[PDB]
């Protein structure tokens, strides 16, 4: 099978070996697309994903390589953004960005601060009870958002009663 992806005019796609780099006005993203007998290449103004194999496993990855590439196109231009709201009942939760990680304090009244490191060149901006996670690499951005929500996970008590935490509000 063969699939061709016309690259956007705002974007430039370069690739050497199994790595592919995509750049736009919003930044750049490099990925490794490695799978048995699936060739990914930049043919002029289009990216080509092809293979002589056509079994269920090969077709699966081909479809995966595509979305990853289209996602890179999107991220280098429009960019990726996830929205998050910080909710707390009794204890005021302090959420702040420090260095390359967001720190949460007073979660459920805890003395020790909870924290997580931000992935990639991802940017995290907080305004009141709202957080916006954004960047070109959907992987890094997507994980960072998830990590923040996970960072307030509770296993010990009934979640229905204790709901304090930062939740993904808008998914791009």
């Amino acid at each position: 099978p063969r699939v061709e992806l016309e690259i956007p005019e705002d974007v430039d796609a370069e690739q050497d070996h199994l790595d592919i780099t995509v750049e736009g006005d919003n930044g750049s993203v490099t990925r490794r697309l490695w799978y048995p007998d699936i060739d990914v290449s930049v043919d002029g103004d289009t990216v080509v994903i092809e293979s002589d194999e056509d079994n269920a496993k090969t077709m699966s990855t081909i479809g995966t390589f595509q979305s990853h590439i289209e996602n890179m196109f999107h991220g280098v231009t429009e960019g990726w953004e996830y929205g998050m709201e910080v909710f707390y009942s009794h204890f005021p939760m302090q959420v702040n960005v420090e260095g390359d990680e967001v720190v949460i304090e007073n979660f459920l009244g805890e003395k020790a601060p909870r924290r997580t490191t931000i992935h990639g060149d991802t940017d995290v901006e907080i305004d009141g009870e709202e957080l916006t996670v954004s960047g070109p690499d959907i992987e890094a951005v997507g994980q960072t958002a998830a990590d923040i929500e996970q960072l307030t996970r509770i296993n010990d008590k009934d979640v229905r009663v204790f709901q304090d935490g930062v939740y993904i509000t808008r998914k791009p």
């Binding site: 490695w34 799978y35 048995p36 007998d37 060739d39």
Partner: protein, 142 residues
């Protein structure tokens, strides 16, 4: 400390057991062989089950002893020993005229033996001797 090898084999991206088999065959024929870039030699399959096997060999033992190597250096050298009658004179002689190295201490480059090559573009389920050694706890001196 200098090893006049008649043959210098490059194990990079080569199937360990297939190279080992030919190096043994040649050592028995009287050739002095030096296997180079051992840390880059390869072994196929699920990294998880491959490692479970080598970890078991590391955990085996008792007073008599079952000293199993952890470095790509010795793993490979042992792989070759299991293909040589190392307890017989001719076998020990062959085994002792074979050596394995991390990286390549020679100026000349080794040759790639036919049939032992692995194409990374066509395979994803394989592991590297170096990766195995690191998992086993070896000191990545290479």
């Amino acid at each position: 400390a200098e090893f006049d090898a008649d043959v210098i084999v490059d194990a990079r991206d080569c199937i360990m057991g297939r190279v080992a088999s030919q190096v043994a065959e040649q050592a028995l024929d009287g050739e002095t062989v030096a296997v180079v870039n051992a840390e880059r030699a390869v072994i196929t399959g699920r990294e998880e089950q491959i490692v479970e096997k080598y970890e078991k060999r590391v955990d085996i033992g008792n007073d008599n002893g079952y000293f199993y190597p952890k470095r790509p250096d010795g793993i490979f050298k042992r792989t070759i020993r299991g293909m040589l009658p190392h307890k017989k004179q001719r076998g020990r002689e062959a085994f002792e005229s074979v050596r394995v190295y991390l990286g390549n201490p020679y100026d000349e480059d080794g040759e790639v033996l036919d049939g032992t090559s692995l194409d990374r573009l066509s395979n994803i389920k394989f592991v590297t001797l170096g990766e195995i050694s690191e998992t086993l706890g070896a000191n990545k001196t290479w």
